Amino acid sequence: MKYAGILAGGIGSRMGNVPLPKQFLDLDNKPILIHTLEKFILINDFEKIIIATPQQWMTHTKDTLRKFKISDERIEVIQGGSDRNDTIMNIVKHIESTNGINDDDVIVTHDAVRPFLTHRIIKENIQAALEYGAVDTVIDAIDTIVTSKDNQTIDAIPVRNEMYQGQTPQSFNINLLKESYAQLSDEQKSILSDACKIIVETNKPVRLVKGELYNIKVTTPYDLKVANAIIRGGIA
Amino acid sequence: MKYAGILAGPKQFLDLDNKPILIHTLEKFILINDFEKIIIATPQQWMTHTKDTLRKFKISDERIEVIQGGSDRNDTIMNIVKHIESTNGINDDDVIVTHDAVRPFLTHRIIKENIQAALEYGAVDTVIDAIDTIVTSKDNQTIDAIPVRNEMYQGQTPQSFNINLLKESYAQLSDEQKSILSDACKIIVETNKPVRLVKGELYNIKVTTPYDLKVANAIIRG
> Quick one: three-class SS letters along A55-73?
HHHHHHHHHHHHHCCCCCC
What's B101's DSSP letter? T
Total residue count of chain B as it appears in this document: 222
Cβ distance of A157 and B197 shorter than 8 Å: no
Cβ distance of A145 and B151 shorter than 8 Å: no
Elucidation technique: X-ray
Best probe of the B interface among A142, A150, A157, A213, by most B CBs < 10 A, is A157
What's A91's DSSP letter? H
Q: Are strands A163-173 and A106-111 parallel, antiparallel or unpaired?
A: antiparallel
Nearest to A145 among B152, B211, B222 (CB): B152
Total residue count of chain A as it appears in this document: 236
Write the CA distances from B138 to A139, A171, B141, B142, integer angstroms. Answer: 14, 21, 8, 8
Distance CA B149, CA A228 (A): 28
What's A160's DSSP letter? G
**Strand stretches in A35-154, DSSP E:** 46-53, 75-79, 106-111, 134-140, 145-147
Distance of CA A194 to the CA centre of its chain: 10
Q: Are strands A106-111 and A2-7 parallel, antiparallel or unpaired?
A: parallel
One-letter amino acid for residue A230 of the chain:
I
Cβ distance of A208 and B183 shorter than 8 Å: no
Cβ distance of A164 and B137 shorter than 8 Å: yes
Distance of CA B218 to the CA centre of its chain: 23
- Between the two ends of chain B, the Cα-to-Cα distance in Å is 35
Flag whether B76 is marked binding: yes
Cis peptide before A169 (omega within 30 of 0): yes
Angle between helices A119-132 and A32-41 (to 10 degrees): 60
Residues of B in contact with A137 (CB under 8 A): none
Question: Given CA atoms A99, A104, A109, A114 in this order, what sign does their dihedral have?
Answer: negative
Residues of B in contact with A149 (CB under 8 A): 151
The binding site of A for CTP comprises 7-10, 81-87
Distance CA A28, CA A30 (A): 6
Distance of CA A218 to the CA centre of its chain: 12
Q: What is the resolution of this structure in A?
A: 2.1
Nearest to B125 among A154, A196, A207 (CB): A154
What's A31's DSSP letter? B
Cβ distance of B142 and A196 shorter than 8 Å: no
Distance CA B70, CA B4 (A): 17
Q: Are strands B35-42 and B64-68 parallel, antiparallel or unpaired?
A: parallel
- Per residue in B47-86, is it b (16+ CB within 10 Å) or e — as a string? beebbebbeeeebeeeebbbbebbeebbebbbbbbebbee
Nearest to A148 among B144, B151, B219 (CB): B151
Q: How many helices and strands (H and E) does chain B possess?
A: 8, 8
Nearest to B185 among A154, A164, A167 (CB): A154
Distance CA B207, CA B72 (A): 19
Best probe of the B interface among A136, A154, A165, by most B CBs < 10 A, is A154
Q: Are B102 and B73 contacting, i.e. CB atoms less than 8 angstroms apart?
A: no
Backbone angles phi, psi at A167, to 5 degrees: -120, -160
Distance CA A48, CA A112 (A): 16
Nearest alpha carbon to residue B125 among A162, A161, A143, A220:
A143
